[PDB]
Amino acid sequence: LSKSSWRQEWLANLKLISVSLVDEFPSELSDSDRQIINEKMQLLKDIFANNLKSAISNNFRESDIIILKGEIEDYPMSSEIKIYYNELQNKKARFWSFMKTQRFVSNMGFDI
Protein backbone atom coordinates (compact mmCIF):
# COMPACT_ATOMS: atom_id res chain seq x y z
CA LEU A 1 0.00 0.00 0.00
CA SER A 2 3.20 2.27 -0.12
CA LYS A 3 6.35 3.30 -2.28
CA SER A 4 6.27 1.62 -5.80
CA SER A 5 2.86 -0.05 -5.14
CA TRP A 6 1.43 3.42 -5.90
CA ARG A 7 3.69 3.81 -9.01
CA GLN A 8 2.66 0.29 -10.21
CA GLU A 9 -1.06 0.93 -9.63
CA TRP A 10 -0.79 4.23 -11.60
CA LEU A 11 1.17 2.61 -14.45
CA ALA A 12 -1.72 0.14 -14.87
CA ASN A 13 -4.45 2.86 -14.78
CA LEU A 14 -2.61 5.13 -17.25
CA LYS A 15 -2.72 2.29 -19.84
CA LEU A 16 -6.54 2.72 -19.62
CA ILE A 17 -6.57 6.54 -19.67
CA SER A 18 -7.08 9.21 -22.38
CA VAL A 19 -4.90 12.31 -21.70
CA SER A 20 -5.50 15.64 -23.38
CA LEU A 21 -2.92 18.45 -23.20
CA VAL A 22 -4.57 21.93 -23.37
CA ASP A 23 -3.85 24.57 -26.13
CA GLU A 24 -4.94 27.71 -24.12
CA PHE A 25 -2.77 29.62 -21.62
CA PRO A 26 -3.43 31.45 -18.31
CA SER A 27 -3.68 35.29 -18.45
CA GLU A 28 -0.80 37.87 -18.62
CA LEU A 29 2.05 35.82 -20.23
CA SER A 30 5.03 37.01 -22.36
CA ASP A 31 6.13 35.29 -25.61
CA SER A 32 9.18 33.75 -23.72
CA ASP A 33 7.02 32.69 -20.73
CA ARG A 34 4.71 30.88 -23.23
CA GLN A 35 7.67 29.30 -25.15
CA ILE A 36 9.30 27.92 -21.96
CA ILE A 37 5.87 26.41 -20.93
CA ASN A 38 5.35 24.98 -24.48
CA GLU A 39 8.75 23.20 -24.48
CA LYS A 40 7.91 21.63 -21.05
CA MET A 41 4.34 20.72 -22.19
CA GLN A 42 5.89 18.93 -25.22
CA LEU A 43 8.04 16.57 -23.03
CA LEU A 44 5.05 15.89 -20.66
CA LYS A 45 3.11 14.86 -23.78
CA ASP A 46 5.98 12.41 -24.62
CA ILE A 47 6.13 10.84 -21.06
CA PHE A 48 2.35 10.36 -21.16
CA ALA A 49 2.31 8.82 -24.65
CA ASN A 50 5.60 6.83 -24.71
CA ASN A 51 6.33 6.00 -21.06
CA LEU A 52 2.99 6.05 -19.24
CA LYS A 53 1.34 4.41 -22.34
CA SER A 54 -1.72 6.79 -22.15
CA ALA A 55 -3.68 7.81 -25.29
CA ILE A 56 -3.13 11.40 -26.38
CA SER A 57 -6.46 13.12 -26.93
CA ASN A 58 -6.96 16.15 -29.23
CA ASN A 59 -10.28 16.85 -27.48
CA PHE A 60 -10.09 17.75 -23.80
CA ARG A 61 -13.76 16.76 -23.37
CA GLU A 62 -12.87 13.25 -24.59
CA SER A 63 -10.25 12.59 -21.82
CA ASP A 64 -9.90 11.28 -18.18
CA ILE A 65 -6.83 13.52 -17.42
CA ILE A 66 -6.48 17.19 -18.76
CA ILE A 67 -2.99 18.82 -18.57
CA LEU A 68 -3.12 22.66 -18.08
CA LYS A 69 -0.45 25.28 -19.01
CA GLY A 70 -0.87 26.70 -15.47
CA GLU A 71 -3.34 26.86 -12.58
CA ILE A 72 -7.07 26.71 -13.55
CA GLU A 73 -7.69 29.83 -11.34
CA ASP A 74 -5.27 31.84 -13.59
CA TYR A 75 -7.27 30.89 -16.73
CA PRO A 76 -9.81 33.54 -17.89
CA MET A 77 -13.57 32.86 -17.43
CA SER A 78 -14.01 33.22 -21.25
CA SER A 79 -11.56 30.37 -22.16
CA GLU A 80 -13.01 27.07 -23.51
CA ILE A 81 -11.20 24.98 -20.84
CA LYS A 82 -12.34 27.16 -17.86
CA ILE A 83 -15.93 27.01 -19.31
CA TYR A 84 -15.67 23.17 -19.43
CA TYR A 85 -14.16 23.00 -15.89
CA ASN A 86 -17.06 25.12 -14.59
CA GLU A 87 -19.74 22.87 -16.18
CA LEU A 88 -18.07 19.77 -14.70
CA GLN A 89 -18.75 21.34 -11.24
CA ASN A 90 -22.33 19.96 -11.59
CA LYS A 91 -21.90 16.11 -11.37
CA LYS A 92 -15.47 13.55 -14.03
CA ALA A 93 -12.05 14.42 -15.59
CA ARG A 94 -8.91 15.33 -13.57
CA PHE A 95 -7.70 18.94 -14.26
CA TRP A 96 -3.99 19.02 -13.49
CA SER A 97 -1.90 22.20 -13.32
CA PHE A 98 1.34 22.45 -15.26
CA MET A 99 3.30 22.25 -12.00
CA LYS A 100 1.22 19.31 -10.61
CA THR A 101 1.74 17.33 -13.85
CA GLN A 102 5.53 17.97 -13.58
CA ARG A 103 5.43 16.73 -9.94
CA PHE A 104 3.44 13.58 -10.96
CA VAL A 105 5.76 12.49 -13.83
CA SER A 106 8.76 13.09 -11.46
CA ASN A 107 7.17 10.71 -8.88
CA MET A 108 6.56 8.29 -11.73
CA GLY A 109 10.37 8.33 -12.37
CA PHE A 110 10.34 10.85 -15.25
CA ASP A 111 12.05 14.08 -14.16
CA ILE A 112 12.63 17.34 -16.16
Binding site: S2, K3, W6, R7, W10, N13, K100, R103, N107
Partner: peptide, 10 residues
Protein backbone atom coordinates in the same frame (compact mmCIF):
# COMPACT_ATOMS: atom_id res chain seq x y z
CA UNK B 1 -10.31 7.52 -6.51
CA UNK B 2 -6.44 7.24 -6.68
CA UNK B 3 -4.07 9.84 -5.17
CA UNK B 4 -2.03 12.14 -7.50
CA UNK B 5 0.65 12.29 -4.78
CA UNK B 6 2.73 9.31 -3.51
CA UNK B 7 2.31 8.04 0.12
CA UNK B 8 4.33 10.65 2.10
CA UNK B 9 5.72 8.73 5.15
CA UNK B 10 8.18 11.10 7.05
Amino acid sequence: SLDSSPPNTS
